[PDB]
Paper text:
Given that the CNKSAM–HYPSAM domain interaction is necessary but not sufficient for KSR–MEK recruitment, we sought structural information on CNK beyond the SAM domain using CNK2–330, which minimally comprises the SAM, CRIC and PDZ domains. We determined a 2.1 Å resolution structure of the complex of CNK2–330 with HYP2–106 by single anomalous dispersion phasing using selenomethionine substituted proteins. The CNK–HYP complex adopts a rigid four-lobe torus (or ring) with extensive interactions between all four domains. As expected, the HYPSAM domain interacts with the CNKSAM domain in a prototypical head-to-tail manner with a buried contact surface of 518 Å2 described previously. A buried contact surface of 961 Å2 between HYPSAM and CNKCRIC is composed predominantly of hydrophobic residues on helix α5 of HYPSAM and on helices α2 and α3 of CNKCRIC. The PDZ domain adopts a canonical fold and, despite its C-terminal position within the SAM-CRIC-PDZ sequence, adopts a central position between the CNKSAM and CNKCRIC domains in the toroid structure, making no direct contacts with HYPSAM. Furthermore, none of the inter-domain interactions mediated by the PDZ domain are canonical in nature. A buried contact surface between CNKPDZ and CNKSAM of 667 Å2 comprises a mixture of hydrophobic and hydrophilic interactions. Importantly, this defect, as well as the reduction in pMEK levels, were fully rescued by co-introduction of the D81R mutation, which restores a favorable salt interaction but with opposite polarity. These results support the relevance of the CNKCRIC–CNKPDZ interface and provide further evidence for the validity of the toroid CNKSAM-CRIC-PDZ–HYPSAM crystal structure. Although the D195K, M197E and V198E mutations in CNK did not impair the elution profile of the CNK–HYP complex on their own, they hampered the ability of CNK–HYP to assemble with KSR–MEK. Together, these results identify a conserved surface in the vicinity of the CRIC-PDZ linker of CNK that mediates a direct interaction with KSR–MEK.
Similar to KSR, the protein Connector eNhancer of KSR (CNK) was identified by genetic means in Drosophila as a key regulatory component of the RAS–ERK pathway. In flies, CNK, like KSR, acts at a step between RAS and RAF to facilitate RAF activation, but its precise mechanism of action remains unresolved. Notably, the N-terminal part of CNK (denoted CNKNT) encompassing the SAM, CRIC and PDZ domains and a 260-residue linker preceding the PH domain can recruit the KSR–MEK complex in a manner dependent on its physical association with the SAM-domain-containing protein hyphen (HYP; also known as Aveugle). Here we show that the fly scaffold proteins CNK and HYP stabilize the KSR–MEK interaction, which in turn enhances RAF–KSR heterodimerization and RAF activation.
Author numbering:
A (entry chain B): 3 to 102, 108 to 166, 169 to 211, 216 to 233, 243 to 286
B (entry chain A): 19 to 105
């Protein structure tokens, strides 16, 4: 059972410790104020400050990690291409509404970075099994990246009439997102993600860790390339640093049980 | 060409002097709050206020530089994803 909302304060500090070396100074206060899983999943900046975490850089370590933890705990059923495209469509429409003379407002520039951010999980999923080796999904990915590059380069001024050009790119990105939502009938885009326990008694895979602490199998029986490791011996590692995930796996002895998120 | 998410606090301070040179008085705020590159990608206008950048004109200028740096990083990451879709 991976009910993060039922985490004891000890499980919270166990997880907090793996985020960054900077967290070690705050574990005592998390335990003293009895921060459980429910309080962790909804933790706010002022509550981090009540715990003595006044450095905003340290707050953002927790908040970024908790945001990944929240997505794993609350929205695993929608962890698929369709709802990634829905996030893209939502951000693009939001950018479009905000646009309704030489200088682009900082707010508009900010909306563009937030819109581009939604492309990253969609594109990342398109470049993994089972979409990676399908010609239509590869062409679709290229169209999304071309539109995203258009948005970013116009915003960076890299490429006369910036607001109408940004508006056209936002509409095109919304249309591209709707291609998955409306035009594709592949059941894979609507398949929920599932968790599987993989027991190892040995083990030749490598772990590629994203910048934000998502750890996937690479360079490789019941484990395939691109599968995300969410626990090692029932310790949740979503959001952990790359180094501490390796340290936890190496110390796990020949007997390691991995909780693995699996690709459709 | 070090990616922003790898920037140390020292890297952020050097970036701040280069792009926010007219606002040197707030440089120590980034050091005191341990604004790494990872933190720089998550700072908002609100967190700059909370850090103590109270002047609206100063904060808007600094916030714009941070957003512009995110766009630069976005362009770099989009090109990396474009190469990953071709190879």
């Amino acid at each position: 059972y991976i009910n993060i909302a039922e985490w004891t304060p000890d499980q919270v500090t166990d997880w907090i410790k793996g985020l960054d070396e900077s967290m070690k100074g705050y574990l005592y206060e998390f335990s003293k104020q009895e921060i459980g899983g429910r309080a962790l999943l909804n933790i706010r900046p002022y509550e981090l400050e009540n715990l003595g975490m006044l450095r905003i850089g340290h707050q953002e370590i927790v908040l970024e990690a908790v945001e990944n933890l929240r997505n794993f705990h609350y929205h695993l059923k929608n962890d698929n291409l369709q709802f990634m495209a829905l996030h893209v469509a939502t951000a693009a429409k939001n950018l479009h509404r905000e646009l309704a003379s030489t200088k682009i407002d900082t707010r508009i520039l900010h909306d563009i970075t937030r819109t581009i951010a939604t492309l990253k999980p969609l594109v990342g999923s398109l470049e993994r099994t089972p979409f990676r080796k399908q010609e239509m999904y590869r062409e679709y990915c290229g169209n999304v990246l071309k539109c995203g590059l258009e948005l970013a380069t116009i915003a960076h001024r890299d490429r006369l009439q910036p607001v109408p050009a940004i508006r056209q790119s936002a509409e095109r990105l919304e249309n591209l997102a709707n291609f998955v939502i409306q035009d594709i009938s592949d059941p894979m885009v609507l398949q929920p993600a599932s968790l599987n326990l993989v027991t190892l008694k040995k083990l030749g895979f490598n772990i590629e860790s994203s910048y934000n602490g998502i750890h996937r199998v690479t360079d490789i029986g019941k484990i395939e390339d691109g599968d995300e490791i969410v626990q090692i011996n029932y310790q949740t590692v979503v959001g952990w640093q790359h180094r501490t995930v390796l340290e936890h796996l190496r110390e796990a002895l020949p007997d390691v049980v991995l909780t693995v998120k699996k690709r459709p | 060409p070090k990616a922003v998410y790898l920037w140390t606090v020292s890297d952020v301070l050097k970036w701040y002097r280069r792009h926010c040179g007219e606002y040197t008085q707030y440089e120590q705020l980034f050091a005191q709050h341990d604004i790494t590159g990872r933190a720089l990608l998550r700072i908002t206008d609100s967190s700059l206020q909370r850090m103590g950048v109270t002047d609206n004109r100063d904060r808007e200028a600094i916030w714009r530089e941070i957003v512009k740096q995110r766009l630069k990083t976005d362009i770099m990451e989009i090109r990396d994803m474009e190469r990953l879709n071709i190879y």
